Amino acid sequence: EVETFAFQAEIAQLMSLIINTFYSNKEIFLRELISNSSDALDKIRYESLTDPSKLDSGKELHINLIPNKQDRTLTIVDTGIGMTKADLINNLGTIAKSGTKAFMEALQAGADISMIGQFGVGFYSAYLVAEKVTVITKHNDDEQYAWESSAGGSFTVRTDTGEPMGRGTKVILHLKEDQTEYLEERRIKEIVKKHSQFIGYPITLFVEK
Numbered sequence: 001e002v003e004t005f006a007f008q009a010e011i012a013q014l015m016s017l018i019i020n021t022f023y024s025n026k027e028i029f030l031r032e033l034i035s036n037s038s039d040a041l042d043k044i045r046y047e048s049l050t051d052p053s054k055l056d057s058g059k060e061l062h063i064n065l066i067p068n069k070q071d072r073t074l075t076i077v078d079t080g081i082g083m084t085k086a087d088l089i090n091n092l093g094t095i096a097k098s099g100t101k102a103f104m105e106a107l108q109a110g111a112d113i114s115m116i117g118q119f120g121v122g123f124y125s126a127y128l129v130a131e132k133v134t135v136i137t138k139h140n141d142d143e144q145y146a147w148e149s150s151a152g153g154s155f156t157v158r159t160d161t162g163e164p165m166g167r168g169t170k171v172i173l174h175l176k177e178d179q180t181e182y183l184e185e186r187r188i189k190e191i192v193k194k195h196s197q198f199i200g201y202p203i204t205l206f207v208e209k
């Protein structure tokens, strides 16, 4: 059972700009997704300070980066607070309407795409490198859901029957054919060292057979 939704017009406009603008510095997508994961991990950590049972769904707070060259996917996994179904539908827990407005007002005034995270919509930088993005998520207060979009103005949400995650979010980037450098170990390591050196959670880069 799959529900299909239209993006708000402003969010479709944001995605089109990310997809269509000539902009070579695409590697910042990974910094933005890792930053989102860190923010989600901070949230569950804070809740656990007054209610330890919030971690019954998983005590480890971490970020995993999982390249798969056979599937042409890069997956960013975190054990953060996760997202409810309502969060997913409401622009993956962001204030994306007002964030997009501010971001586009910054671009025509000199800013570049790399500053997207300062406007709270860094998730959408995934479309710098991905033709399709799948988001699997589990929040303590809801069931496990899968969000998906290839842009084009719509996204889907369905209950996820895949492998249970316990708690957190998995962002699966189905990479564009010409963006496979982001599956190479040395390239991922370089980006993490350059942009994510001060993230306060272990970032484990998985290797492939």
Ligand SMILES: CC1CC(=O)N(c2ccc(F)cc2F)C(=O)C1
Residues within 6 Å of the ligand: 064, 066, 075, 077, 078, 079, 163, 164, 165, 166, 167, 168, 170
């Ligand atoms: C809490 C997560 C941690 C993790 O990393 N994984 C995972 C492991 C391998 C893989 F390919 C995809 C994953 F989401 C899980 O399933 C549970």
